[PDB]
């Protein structure tokens, strides 16, 4: 659907970036290793590969499943 404000409260099912790439799961370290895991960000709703905003950036984002592109913003409109 959409997100409000900076989308740190977004708990949707969206999981595709702005360029149509599929998001990587927050609990996997492949293809990109990272520290934005549910253990490090317990209140961010980090589940499956859904778009989220653990670091309080401008809007929901995800690590991508393309080995060449670490992360991008998600394909979501601002409510």
From Swiss-Prot:
* Region annotated Disordered, chain positions: 21-41
Domain (Kringle): give its ranges: 2-79
List S-S links within the chain: 2-79, 23-62, 51-74
Chain sites annotated for binding L-lysine? 57, 70
Tree of life domain: Eukaryota
Membrane-spanning regions, if any? none
The name this protein carries in UniProt is Angiostatin
Q: Which residues of the full protein are shown?
A: 376 to 454 of 810
